[PDB]
Amino acid sequence: SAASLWGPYKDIWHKVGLLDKILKKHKPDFISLFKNPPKNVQQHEKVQKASTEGVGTRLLPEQLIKEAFILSDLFDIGELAAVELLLAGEHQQLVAVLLYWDGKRCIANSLKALIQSRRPELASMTTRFTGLTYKVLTLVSQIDVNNEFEKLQRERGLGSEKHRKEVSDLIKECRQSLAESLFAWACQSPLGKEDTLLLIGH
């Protein structure tokens, strides 16, 4: 499972820039994606009960439930994960949206830092499962999905530009950081002809 908090990611990055092997060790988070949990129906009943449990459990008031549903509908995301996100970040509104993006931003930056900066046990650790390399292409996809546009179309007659500029911004940054990771991989060459062909196609 992946910790769905921004904080461990933020602190770890701060260590670099100290690197503690322990925190870094629970590495799989640097998947860069949220492929496994998308919005789930099964999770909605769980949340609706007002009792929610993560992979302790906590009571859920109505106000929180609304923020949580806003997240899942807004970004096709699992309802419980969405809650972990609200919990981690100070509850103010929505904050949950922030943690969602900050968590991703940090992960990407760290991967970028490692792949580019170090020349190494850790880089070997990160790449070794690869796996990051499998994921890099998918990560550029996904940012691609134009759910935002669909929302925009539905919105017409009503209009929430600002919330969108905010998301479009986080994504562009993600693409940009994604660029650095790919480049870094090339400098730290992965093996053969297949990747190039795949990328050329993508």
Curated annotation (Swiss-Prot):
Expressed in the testis. It is found in: Nucleus membrane; Nucleus, Nuclear pore complex. It comes from the Eukaryota. It is linked to Nephrotic syndrome 13: A form of nephrotic syndrome, a renal disease clinically characterized by severe proteinuria, resulting in complications such as hypoalbuminemia, hyperlipidemia and edema. Kidney biopsies show non-specific histologic changes such as focal segmental glomerulosclerosis and diffuse mesangial proliferation. Some affected individuals have an inherited steroid-resistant form and progress to end-stage renal failure. Belongs to the NUP186/NUP192/NUP205 family. Part of the nuclear pore complex (NPC). Forms a complex with NUP35, NUP93, NUP155 and lamin B. Does not interact with TPR. Interacts with TMEM209 and MYC. Plays a role in the nuclear pore complex (NPC) assembly and/or maintenance. May anchor NUP62 and other nucleoporins, but not NUP153 and TPR, to the NPC. In association with TMEM209, may be involved in nuclear transport of various nuclear proteins in addition to MYC. This is Nuclear pore complex protein Nup205. It comes from Homo sapiens.
